[PDB]
Amino acid sequence: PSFVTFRGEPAEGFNHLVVDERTGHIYLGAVNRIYKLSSDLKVLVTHQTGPDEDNPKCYPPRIVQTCNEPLASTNNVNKMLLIDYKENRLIACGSLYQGICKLLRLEDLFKLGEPFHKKEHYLSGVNESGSVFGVIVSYSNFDDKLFIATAVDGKPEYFPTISSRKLTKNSEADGMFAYVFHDEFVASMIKIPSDTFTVIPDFDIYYVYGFSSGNFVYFLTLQPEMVSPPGSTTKEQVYTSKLVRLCKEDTAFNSYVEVPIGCERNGVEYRLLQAAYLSKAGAVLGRTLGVRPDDDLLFTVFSKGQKRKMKSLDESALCIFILKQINDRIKDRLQSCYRGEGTLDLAWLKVKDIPCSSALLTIDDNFCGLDMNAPLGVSEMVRGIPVFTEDRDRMTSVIAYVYKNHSLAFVGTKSGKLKKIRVDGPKGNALQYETVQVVDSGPVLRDMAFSKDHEQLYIMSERQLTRVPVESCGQYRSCGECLGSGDPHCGWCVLHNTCTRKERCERSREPRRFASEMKQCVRLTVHPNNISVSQYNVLLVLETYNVPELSAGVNCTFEDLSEMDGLVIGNQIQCYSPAAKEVPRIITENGDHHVVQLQLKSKETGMTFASTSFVFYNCSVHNSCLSCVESPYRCHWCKYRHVCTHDPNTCSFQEGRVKLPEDCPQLLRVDKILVPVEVIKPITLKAKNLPQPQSGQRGYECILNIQGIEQRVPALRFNSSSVQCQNTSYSYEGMEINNLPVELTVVWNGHFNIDNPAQNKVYLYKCGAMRESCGLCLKADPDFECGWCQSPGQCTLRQHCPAHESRWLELSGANSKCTNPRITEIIPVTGPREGGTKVTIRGENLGLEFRDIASHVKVAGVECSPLVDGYIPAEQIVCEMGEAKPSQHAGFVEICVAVCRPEFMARSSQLYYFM
């Protein structure tokens, strides 16, 4: 699903947002533009407030008087936006006019009026958006007004930072934005003193948030370094975030109060307000908080430290203030001043500290302020209760609301994401979900308002407004998953088999109709978890917990494949398995088994809610004993029937059943089976649980799978654990390879192949195609049993050579003198006369021991000394030649095995050359 949004109609910019309580129309302040949108975020109307030729430096703007300074077309930023329901209009205060305010008609955005003429009509030079805030308070006629705070930019004479102003009925009327009570001595406004400007050049008050409570007006503000941090002269500026308050009723402005505010987390300081939101707790939070229903609360967001208001730190914390607690702090402070203790301590306002005067008074919450001990500051900074802290991504904005008594908090992030937090200090827990309806790359603004119906939450970005629903639980398929996510909005509507909010679930109020906690689910179990393919229409019992009354009716659906009716008794559901006709359609090609998700389809909703792992196995498919028993499931093998089945009874008879893998029938391995070609030899075998062939059944045979020829030799089964193929000889054609492993299969009764787990094979091995010389044969492995036969002048097994004499010669254990050494080739063909060369000689029939070859090697006359490590017996000799200074130049290489006997010597085909 996608979230409904409004792209910066002026793609160019965006600043403030507000919702009309009755209509749901959304008004959006922006630079050069003010838009009226539908609840859906469709564009209703666009107003052009923008680009005006102007100059910030000029006082009474160009229209009133001529300005020496040059003008340029500049952008008019919507500083503030406030809905005046009574007046049926919108106060949309801009800038770039010296801050002239505009009045737009509610429905059409028709400009009712925009008073420019008088000085009061000008609010502030300040170009920055959001640095201003305020509240509109109204009563019936002859009772009314507007409270607004703004930054000065060092304009102290021109504009007041905080003021109480008049809002006349007629937009045309001159009176607008006039101070409620103006006296030569005191006016309902607060200006910044010139002295304070000189001391600290830049001092300015930026107003972030503001709200009316009970009968007062509060502002969250940011100020400069004044005694904080201490500093003799100007240098760096750090800010202190404070709370301000006024009686609505005080024309005098005596009620002004100002406490610093912040909160700390494990020794980390969070001093700077990003945003705030006044709200209600609802029954849950209020109770543990210890509040009355009416009592208010203030969620806030603060960044770490005192540094860089322009660009704050990522570290940010969401804190909380109970209004009762702040009211107490203020009352506590006042009751103290009335004690006469200490000074007023408000640095920016009063440079010279005036003392507090003691007096008899009943100090109440109602206290509006008096002439003496006039505007005052505060010493003890008020600490707030921390809630959630984000280190990686800074929180920008916040909102909250009461839902079914649980308090949900919304928090914008620098990333363009919203967090949905259930505050559970008073309850018990944390953050439920996070969403990126907004804008994936870059942030969200403080103006974040819930709709009137409270279905959605409009989230504003620099670029776009996004209608983020306070829920999209539908994404969750199962009770287990729904309750699993934890985003507090979601619950499992049992009968509907869907995941949504309480309001959405019909009849959720009724018992067990709606599930909040996983325990309430859905958990399902089937008693016959595994059913064989062969079986049909088996009775199954279903155990389900945390489900609503099913009396509407339920069907069992194994999958999309089938569906069977069920009857309910007790706390169980009884359904039947599918027919054999139906079951195999599924099973085919899945083989061993197929796990299927058996679901329950409710009659009323018609959607599958609950599932379980259901296995269709089916033992019968197994072709062999090993697969049947040895496999992963409970299956029994019938030796006689030679079939695998679940039921013991189905087997031929009692003695026939195979429960254990050892009992199958399988062939055990013995030392490797060596088989010479052309020799008559028996092959004894060992095995286990070999069956005695029953009536109508034949005996055992050994089948050798040789590609050239497959041999069928009958065998005898001596007992349950031994077999033997009868005397026979085997061969393969080709003479290609010495050792050929061959798969062998033991069969009985013609087709029945006994299992061969090890997959034992028979090695058919075949005498010197390779070796013409006696030395080479005796050199070869003793395993081959191949040996040299003197009369033939050839080499073969004893079997192969006739014995006129008692002996054919085999190296008994190397104690066998032989013959005819030959040199195939040697490396380094050439060498230096000086010697030292390593000659590598490769031959066929050399000596078996190193000791004999040593002293044997000679290159011509030159003595050559062989290397032990380098020497590979009868194959190769590595030898190092000595000093060659002799006259020969080139000479043949000679090796004398033990002794230079005439039969015993070998000379190289090509000569070694000295250079």
Q: Which residues bind a copy of itself (CB under 8 A)?
A: 47-49, 63-65, 104, 108-113, 116-117, 171-174, 653, 692-696, 699, 714, 716, 718-720, 726
Q: How far is the CB of 716 from a copy of itself (least distance, A)?
A: 5
The pairing of beta strand 594-602 with beta strand 554-559? antiparallel
Judged by beta carbon, residue 116 or residue 536, the one nearer a copy of itself is: 116
**What burial letters (b/e) apply to 36-60, b meaning 16+ CB within 10 Å?**
bbebebeeeebbebbebebbeebeb
Backbone angles phi, psi at 893, to 5 degrees: -95, 140
Lookup result for tokens 């007041």: 160
Q: How far is the CB of 727 from a copy of itself (least distance, A)?
A: 9
Cβ distance 261 to 272 under 8 Å?
A: no
Beta-bridge partner residues of 723: 685, 717
- As measured in angstroms, the least distance from the Cβ of 751 to a copy of itself is 18
Contacts of 667 (CB under 8 A, 6+ apart): 685, 686, 687, 723, 746, 754, 755, 756, 757, 758, 760
CA–CA separation, 703 vs 755, rounded Å? Answer: 13
Q: Which residue lies nearer to a copy of itself by CB, 503 or 710?
A: 710
DSSP-derived 3-state class of residue 250: coil
**Spatial CA neighbour of 576 closest among 535, 615, 546:** 535
Give, as one character, the DSSP assignment of residue 179.
B
Q: Which is nearer to a copy of itself, 170 or 357 (CB)?
A: 170
In the complex with a copy of itself, the residue whose CB is nearer, 545 or 653, is 653
CB of 722 to a copy of itself, least distance (A): 11
Rounded to the nearest whole angstrom, what is the least distance from the CB of residue 30 to a copy of itself in the complex? 14
How far apart CA 751 and CA 624 sit, in angstroms, is 12
Q: What is d(CA 505, CA 484) in angstroms, rounded to the nearest whole number?
A: 18
* Identity of the residue, 85 or 718, whose beta carbon is nearer to a copy of itself in the bound complex: 718
CB 895 within 8 A of CB 823: yes
Smallest separation (angstroms) from a copy of itself to the CB of 289:
47
**Contact present, 32 and 47 (Cβ < 8 Å):** no
Q: In what order do the strands lie in the sheet with 636-638?
A: 643-645, 636-638, 657-658
User: Quick one: tokens of 877?
Assistant: 């000799």
* Residue 478 one-letter amino acid: S
Distances (CA, A) of 161 to 155, 203, 310, 399: 10, 11, 19, 26
Phi, psi of 343 (to 5 degrees): -110, 175
CB of residue 19 to a copy of itself, shortest distance in Å = 22
At its nearest, how many Å lie between a copy of itself and the CB of residue 339? 53
Contact 90, 134 (CB under 8 A): no
Q: Which is nearer to a copy of itself, 110 or 913 (CB)?
A: 110
Cβ closest to a copy of itself, residue 64 vs residue 368: 64
**Hunting for tokens 């908080």 — which residue is that?**
289
Q: Tell which residue, 299, 290, 236, 237, has the closest CA to residue 263.
A: 299
How far apart are CB 179 and a copy of itself at their closest, in Å?
20
Q: Which is nearer to a copy of itself, 704 or 857 (CB)?
A: 704
Q: Give the C-alpha separation, 701 to 726, whole Å.
A: 9
φ and ψ at residue 482, rounded to 5 degrees? -55, -55
* Distance in Å, CB of 719 to a copy of itself, minimum: 6
At 295, list the tokens: 């009592």
Q: At closest approach, how far in Å is the CB of 702 from a copy of itself? A: 13
- SS3 at position 588: coil
CA distance linking residue 432 with residue 80, whole number of Å: 33
* Minimum distance, C-beta of residue 720 to a copy of itself, in the bound complex (Å): 7
Residue type, 432: Q
Minimum distance from residue 744 beta carbon to a copy of itself (Å): 19
End-to-end CA distance of the chain: 89
User: Could you give phi then psi for residue 508, rounded to 5 degrees?
Assistant: -65, -20
Which residue, 35 or 147, is less far from a copy of itself as judged by CB? 35
CB of 295 to a copy of itself, least distance (A): 43
**Whose Cβ is closer to a copy of itself: residue 173's or residue 827's?**
173
DSSP 67-136: -SS--EEE-------EEETTTTEEEEE-SSSSSBEEEEETTT--EEE---SSSTTB------SSS-EEEE
Q: Which of 233, 719 has the CB closer to a copy of itself?
A: 719
333 versus 717: smaller Cβ distance to a copy of itself = 717
Residue 182 identity (one-letter amino acid): H
Shortest spacing between CB 121 and a copy of itself, in angstroms: 11
Nearest approach in angstroms of CB 694 to a copy of itself is 5
Task: Please report how close the Cβ of residue 72 comes to a copy of itself at its closest, in angstroms.
Answer: 17
Choose between 441 and 695: whose C-beta lies nearer to a copy of itself.
695
Q: Which is nearer to a copy of itself, 652 or 796 (CB)?
A: 652
Residue nearer to a copy of itself on the CB measure, 694 or 824: 694
Q: Output phi, psi for 246, to 5 deg.
A: -150, 150
Place of tokens 């009061």: 120
Task: Say if residues 437 and 462 touch (Cβ distance below 8 Å).
Answer: no
> Between residues 537 and 692, which has the closer beta carbon with respect to a copy of itself?
692
Least CB distance from residue 697 to a copy of itself, whole Å? 8
Minimum CB distance to a copy of itself smaller for 2 or for 65: 65
229, 237 contact by CB (below 8 A): no
Q: Which is nearer to a copy of itself, 84 or 393 (CB)?
A: 84
Q: What is the Rg, in whole angstroms, of the alpha carbon atoms belonging to the chain?
A: 50
Distance CA 409, CA 431 (A): 9
Measure the CA–CA gap between 389 and 400, rounded to whole angstroms. 17
